[PDB]
Design a protein around this ligand. Structure first.
Ligand SMILES: O=C(O)[C@H](O)c1ccccc1
Length: 315
């Protein structure tokens, strides 16, 4: 069985080059070639369309951003709140472990098999020409966001979110439609924004983050032997979360040569700015609790579990 894989990111991106490709090699080797992943040479549809591409059987495997589906992945938001996680590795592992233990029964990923979830690193506020040093500096900025938490944060701090998938960021910024972008560090470089962006403000534990899901068509999974199904599952979940998180973190760290290099004015959010953002976003947790209750899950348990686990990992 050869599983087709569609990606809406360039093949050189961390997610593909340093996560999905090595992961596919792990699957091949662990099933003696009986299961392989074939990366299709083009995206088969637009980024948000990738969930349905899998569900409809157009491709066997993909990754989807939880930000790209307004209303549909509300339960993932516990993992991406402002100021909550130092690295993609710790957040990915804690996000998956929490989702697997408490949230799977809510069926947010209806119609496909959910293999695993990961998160990227700390979100940064990047802008083309306008520094962000006090809360008022966000007012009116048109900021490209994925959607989801990034969008919730942009709106809360008084910016005007432009919710579009990541690959649109270069066009929107280069043409001056957007004033800025919420991205993790690596994206500054992989999306080729570092000759446009001149300003960045970093926040302890991130301004926000985003989670992705790796999914497989259910009929395709059913084509594997029981042993190979078990193997694919063993190589997914927490194992996948760690593999992906490590890729993101490695790319984030590489990107610091550009962040720290002098052409970008690099700001560390001061205590006043952080507190102003906390104050604007203070209701987000209760919003998530309310959604958790609506979905029939143990909100306080899941939230407490995630926090305990990420705090420990981060140590
Ligand atoms: O901002 C987004 O669109 C999303 O979080 C994302 C997707 C892919 C790379 C970086 C970030």
């Amino acid at each position: 069985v050869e599983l087709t894989l569609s990606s809406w990111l360039p093949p050189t991106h961390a997610v593909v080059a340093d996560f999905l490709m090595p992961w596919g090699e792990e699957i091949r080797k662990a099933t003696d070639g009986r299961v392989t992943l074939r990366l299709l040479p083009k995206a088969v549809t637009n980024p948000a369309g990738h969930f349905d591409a899998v569900r409809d059987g157009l491709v066997d495997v993909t990754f989807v951003s939880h930000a790209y589906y307004p209303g549909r992945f509300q339960l993932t938001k516990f993992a991406v709140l402002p100021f909550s996680g130092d690295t993609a590795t710790s957040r990915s592992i804690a996000a998956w472990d929490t989702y697997e233990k408490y949230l799977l029964k809510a069926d947010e990923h209806k119609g496909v098999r959910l293999l695993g979830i990961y998160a990227h690193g700390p979100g940064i506020a990047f802008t083309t020409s306008k520094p962000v040093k006090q809360i008022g500096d966000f007012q009116g900025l048109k900021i490209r966001v994925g959607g989801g938490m990034a969008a919730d944060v942009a709106k809360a701090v008084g910016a005007s979110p432009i919710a579009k998938p990541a690959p649109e960021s270069y066009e929107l910024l280069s043409t001056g439609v957007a004033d800025g972008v919420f991205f993790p560090a690596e994206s500054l470089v992989s999306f080729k924004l570092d000759s446009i962006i001149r300003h960045a403000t970093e926040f302890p534990g991130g301004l926000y983050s985003d989670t992705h899901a790796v999914i497989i068509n259910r009929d395709a999974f059913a084509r594997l032997s029981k042993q190979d199904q078990d193997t694919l599952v063993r190589l997914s979940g927490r194992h996948l979360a760690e593999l992906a998180g490590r890729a993101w973190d490695t790319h984030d760290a590489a990107a610091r040569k550009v962040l720290e290099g002098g052409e970008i004015e690099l700001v560390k959010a001061d205590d006043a700015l952080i507190e102003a953002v906390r104050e604007r976003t203070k209701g987000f947790e209760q919003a998530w609790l309310d959604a958790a209750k609506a979905k029939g899950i143990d909100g306080p348990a899941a939230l407490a579990s995630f926090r305990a686990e990420i705090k420990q990992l981060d140590q």
